[model samples]
Target: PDQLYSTLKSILQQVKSHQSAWPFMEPVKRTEAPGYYEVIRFPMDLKTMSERLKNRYYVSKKLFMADLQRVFTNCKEYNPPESEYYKCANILEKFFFSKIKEAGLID
Candidate 1:
């Protein structure tokens, strides 16, 4: 991390002054390529066919929220159809006759 050190310090320690060969390395390589490699390629920078719309590629928070909301909304507890076993039991009991009738169910 130290790019510079006092000459007297090196002389006192019998060490040589040094500096990084390259501050940074090259970009990246393609698939199937090997050997030493540097640089960072990430999914964050990659876009899909739809995202590349007109080459004006962009991420819309509004669209993302809408999709995310739809996904979460589907996480609600499963409710079987009225003719199902549990609902049928509810219908047979008619414990909440008046309340059930409010939804057009008696038997």
Candidate 2:
């Protein structure tokens, strides 16, 4: 899960870093932005922790949920200009939390 969280954060930062490089508001487009491609391509596998990691890294459901919360918060706060990249992040924020709930992370 650490890998997922770090990867997501990096993708988020890369997206934000390029915001001002755009010619106008909204620094992303479907054809040319990392946000649209990298951000949406995470594995986010839904298997059980053990099955998912295969002893690679130990992570509790609670801890995993916390990571998700962190990423969701970052994604939410990344209010870049109106662009497809921002739109992708918006959708990711929703999906991140929804996946946590769907995984039965907590009450």
Candidate 3:
């Protein structure tokens, strides 16, 4: 979400403060975004992912969780400097699983 922008701003500020041309030097890639592709990307947004799949599969909980789990797993494995990405993933995961619970699918 706003994580990328915040991280970028932080890095830029740090670079400006350090007053070095080699500001590119960091522990990790400056553009490393964990959830951007699967979570924020078009057609993969949470609502679309859940709604489209459920519509196609006719509300199958197994299919929904399985598909959601793929993205969720990717979200978990993502290790970016910004913990906000992790936070976003955690929220998304909880939302999807909560959907299942609301459907009387999970205990």
Best by lDDT: 3
Q: Could you tell me the lDDT of residue 89 within candidate 2?
A: 52
**Model 2 residue 74 lDDT?**
40
lDDT of 2 by residue, 1-107 (tens): 67655543443343334433122223234565445445544322223322334544434555555433443344334446565545655565555555555545445
TM-score of structure candidate 2: 0.36
Can you give the TM-score per candidate against the true fold? 0.19, 0.36, 0.44
Off by over 4 Å in 3: 1-55
Better of 1 and 2 by lDDT: 2
Clashes by residue pair, model 3 = none
lDDT of 3 by residue, 1-107 (tens): 24433433343233223322122122223267534455533222243443443345424445545545655455455545355555655665565455456545575
| Worst 10 contiguous positions by lDDT, candidate 1 | 15-24
Q: Which one wins on TM-score?
A: 3
Q: After superposition, how far is residue 55 of candidate 1 from its true place, in Å?
A: 12
What is each predicted model's overall lDDT from 0 to 1? 0.26, 0.43, 0.43
Each model's backbone clash number: 0, 0, 0
